[PDB]
């Protein structure tokens, strides 16, 4: 089942598209999860919003200027918070001569310019904005209400974790980046590109994720000594030439407007935006995730870092392992190749 662990793309019909969780179980039955990242092209009939002509006055309250320091394919990104600005104000800066996408032929050419110019002319990313651009009545793949077992957190506790069980928007310009990371608590993510220029992605198969972490620790041994989970700080940029040079398997994919990407538990990903765009994202879970959450290596050294109590999940879905887990004796090893139990339907 996807033995190459390559990024797969799916084209669901509207009947297949309707049940979100059941379609994630399906793509896993096809091996999609082995790559760490999958693309889903929604049916042509489906639109999450009638038009995006009305969002220019939307406030980006904490835009980030992205200062990148480094060389030889290894970089640290320092996110400087700027004053609030509207989407109109942001698009003007994005599309300006100073910040707009360079001219280019093939994607590989734009990819080279990004890795060459990453540390110059720091861009502004309208990142981590609370909100959704879904119209209230869109019932299929609505990032505001996906209906997965991750809803157990708020249902049980009342706790909302912004961007994790609530939606975030990302207004990009050229050369804006997301550093190497897995999701908080090693969850899944969903990412829909509402409009604009593409978003390109790098992915490491979950089954080789530990190899990426070992490599990253050797390259940033200071950071590793102060925090086991330093990649969770979302500051570490590593080029695909460095991954290739140190034998880390990875794939790349470019997401276009109107496409979803799905990241899988313990799937390391990074990337960049090609130009002015807008993506929406949130996290979600399947039953397969519960073990990932139990075993997630968490960031020690920072306040406001995302932690989820696994108790409720182990009680409900692994009641036989509860007392053993609670006693610290649960030695389950994760097999990254296995699809979620909900996939049994298709297998």
């Amino acid at each position: 089942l996807n033995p190459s662990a390559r990024i797969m793309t799916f084209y669901p019909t509207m009947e297949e598209f309707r049940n979100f969780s059941r379609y994630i179980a399906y793509i896993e039955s096809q091996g999609a999860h082995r790559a760490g990242l999958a693309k889903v092209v929604p049916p042509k009939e489906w639109k999450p919003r009638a038009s995006y002509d009305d969002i220019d006055d939307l406030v980006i309250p904490a835009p980030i200027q992205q200062l990148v320091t480094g060389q030889s394919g290894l970089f640290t990104q320092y996110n400087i918070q700027k004053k609030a600005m509207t989407v109109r104000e942001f698009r003007k800066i994005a599309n300006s001569d100073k910040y707009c996408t360079p001219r280019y032929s093939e994607f590989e050419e734009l990819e080279r310019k990004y890795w060459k110019n990453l540390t110059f002319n720091p861009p502004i990313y309208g990142a981590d904005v609370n909100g959704t651009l879904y119209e209230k009545h869109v019932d299929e793949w609505n990032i505001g209400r996906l209906r997965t077992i991750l809803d157990l957190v708020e249902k049980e506790s009342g706790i909302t974790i912004e961007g994790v069980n609530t939606p975030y928007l990302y207004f990009g310009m050229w050369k804006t980046s997301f550093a190497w990371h897995t999701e908080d608590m090693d969850l899944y993510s969903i990412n829909y590109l509402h409009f604009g220029e593409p978003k390109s992605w790098y992915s490491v198969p979950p089954e080789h994720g530990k190899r990426l972490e070992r490599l990253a620790k050797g390259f940033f041994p200071g950071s590793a000594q102060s925090c086991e989970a330093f990649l969770r700080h979302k500051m570490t940029l590593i080029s695909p030439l460095m991954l290739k040079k140190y034998g880390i398997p990875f794939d790349k994919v470019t997401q276009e407007a109107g496409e979803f990407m799905i990241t899988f538990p313990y799937g390391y990903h990074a990337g960049f935006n090609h130009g002015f765009n807008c993506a929406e994202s949130t996290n979600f879970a399947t039953r397969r995730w519960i073990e990932y959450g139990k075993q997630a290596v968490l960031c020690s050294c920072r306040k406001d870092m995302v932690k989820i109590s696994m108790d409720v999940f182990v009680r409900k879905f692994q009641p036989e392992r509860y007392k053993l887990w609670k006693a610290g004796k649960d030695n389950t090893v994760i097999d990254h190749t296995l699809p979620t139990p909900e996939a049994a339907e298709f297998l």
């Binding site: 904490a62 980030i64 320092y78 996110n79 400087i80 918070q81 990142a127 981590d128 957190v153 506790s157 706790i159 974790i161 912004e162 961007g163 994790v164 975030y168 908080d184 700080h233 979302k234 500051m235 996290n283 920072r302 406001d304 870092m305 995302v306 932690k307 989820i308 109590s309």
Partner: peptide
């Protein structure tokens, strides 16, 4: 435990 925010600390 539960809590936090996904938005990483800005500088």
């Amino acid at each position: 435990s539960t809590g936090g925010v996904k938005k990483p600390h800005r500088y």
